[PDB]
């Protein structure tokens, strides 16, 4: 028996679908950040040249609200040789005060200064925060609080109030306009533990209604009927082989995935490598650990001194585990990492460990203290 | 001049549409008799 759901979200529809004819799909319009910006541009007393500059500027704003090209690019894109750069700067300054304030900023310091320029002068710790942002913004990034205190010539309490005021601002002003809705994915194959071993089964969300129109032509569709069956068969076989070979990844998580490639599955299932590369792309499986693309289980390898091979994902997981528990007073350099993984039988280089650390987005040793 | 009278006539005729469903001579009053 297939598991029956013990809870669910009652369906939104509450009608009897009586009408036998409904129109074709057309869609609606959406208001993104740039639509709102242009709507504000039109209702502003600009000029023709100013409106052209504003159009070119708003074209360059990204999803976070940050300008993505230098002002020289915009000035070139205007295409008129009488226009200087100060006019572009003035138009940019005017645009930067549109709702939300701070949009179309060159960098973080500029956005923070723009936001602080709008607060009334009676805000208590305004000058101190302005000085911190304007002059020394990376000493705050290092969480130093002592060299910054040695330069700003201030006591502890004023610095704490200024930091709290600075961190109450918005670093990404353009994310307020939410035109998007979180989209999701539908798993195609579900993996569950039966008799202590993991077995796979196709998702039953598809359309298995095998029907024909014998009332009146369907010979061509008879071939598509079995084309769908072939697709289901190949997907099921490939996923079954992947799960059978990876019985230990599900049981104990990562650090135990095997170093498999397309050729292994191609030999196992008796199909060309290209077919395996096509099936296992943008198709997902759901496990009690999460949703994973079938491509996730193919990985490289490094030589193991014991005579075997170690997958790169296992080494990445080991690097993550080691770095997560390093010495807080003095963190670990990759030279230390290559030594710790050496004694375990993993024979990797040092630059490879640095590459793995970079892929995981982990700051270097000096930045982790 | 410029009045659209065809539309006015058509509406005048069409508006009351829903209200519609779907051996001898004896003179009645005094007067001279005319034949033609």
């Amino acid at each position: 028996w297939d598991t029956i759901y013990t809870a669910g979200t009652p369906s939104g529809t509450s009608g009897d679908y009586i009408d036998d004819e409904l129109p074709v799909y057309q869609g609606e319009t959406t208001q993104t950040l740039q639509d709102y910006l242009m709507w504000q541009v039109e209702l502003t007393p600009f000029s023709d040249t100013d409106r052209a500059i504003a159009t070119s500027i708003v074209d360059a704003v990204d999803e976070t609200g940050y300008l993505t090209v230098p002002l020289e690019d915009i000035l070139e894109s205007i295409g008129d040789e009488e226009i200087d750069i100060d006019e572009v700067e003035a138009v940019l300054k005017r645009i930067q005060r549109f709702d939300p304030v701070g949009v179309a900023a060159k960098d973080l310091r500029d956005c923070l200064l723009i936001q602080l320029s709008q607060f009334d002068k009676t805000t208590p710790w305004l000058e101190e925060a302005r000085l911190i942002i304007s002059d020394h913004l990376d000493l705050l990034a290092n969480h130093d609080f002592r060299t910054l205190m040695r330069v700003t010539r201030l006591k502890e309490d004023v610095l704490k109030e200024a930091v709290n005021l600075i961190q109450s601002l918005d670093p990404r002003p353009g994310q307020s306009i939410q035109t998007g809705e979180p989209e999701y994915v539908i798993p195609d194959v579900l993996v569950r533990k039966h008799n202590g071993h993991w077995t796979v089964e196709l998702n039953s969300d598809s359309i298995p209604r095998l029907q024909i129109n014998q009332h009146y032509n369907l010979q061509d569709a008879k071939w598509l009927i079995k084309s769908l069956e072939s697709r289901n068969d190949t997907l099921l076989r490939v996923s079954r082989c992947i799960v059978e070979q990876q019985q230990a990844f599900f049981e104990q998580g990562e650090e135990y995935m095997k170093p498999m490639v397309l050729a292994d599955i191609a030999q196992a299932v008796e199909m060309h490598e290209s077919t395996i590369s096509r099936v296992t792309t943008q198709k997902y499986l759901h496990s009690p650990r999460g949703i994973f693309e079938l491509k996730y289980f193919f990985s490289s390898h490094v030589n193991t001194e014991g005579g075997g091979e170690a997958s790169s994902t296992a080494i990445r997981a080991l690097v993550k585990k080691l770095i997560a528990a390093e010495n807080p007073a003095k963190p670990l350099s990759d030279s230390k990492l290559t030594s710790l993984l050496s004694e375990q039988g993993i024979m990797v280089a040092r630059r490879t460990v640095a590459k793995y650390r970079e892929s995981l987005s982990i700051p270097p040793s000096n930045q982790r203290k | 001049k410029g009045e659209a009278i065809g539309v006015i006539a058509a509406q005048s005729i069409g508006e009351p549409g829903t209200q519609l469903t779907m051996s001898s001579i004896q003179v009645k009053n005094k007067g001279s008799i005319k034949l033609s």
Partner: protein, 49 residues
């Protein structure tokens, strides 16, 4: 429904063409007050990222 004390007469054009004139005491006593309930749902899912 509810039992209402009623009179049949024209009152200054406020019951013209099937209109109804209602006392303020009817409103004060919450005789025709109704309760409406609504449901909303938030679903925490799992995705690729």
């Amino acid at each position: 429904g509810q039992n209402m004390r009623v009179a049949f007469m024209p009152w200054n054009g406020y019951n013209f063409e099937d209109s109804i004139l209602v006392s303020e005491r009817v409103v004060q006593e919450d005789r025709f007050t109704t309760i409406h309930i609504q449901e909303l749902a938030c679903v925490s899912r799992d995705t690729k990222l």
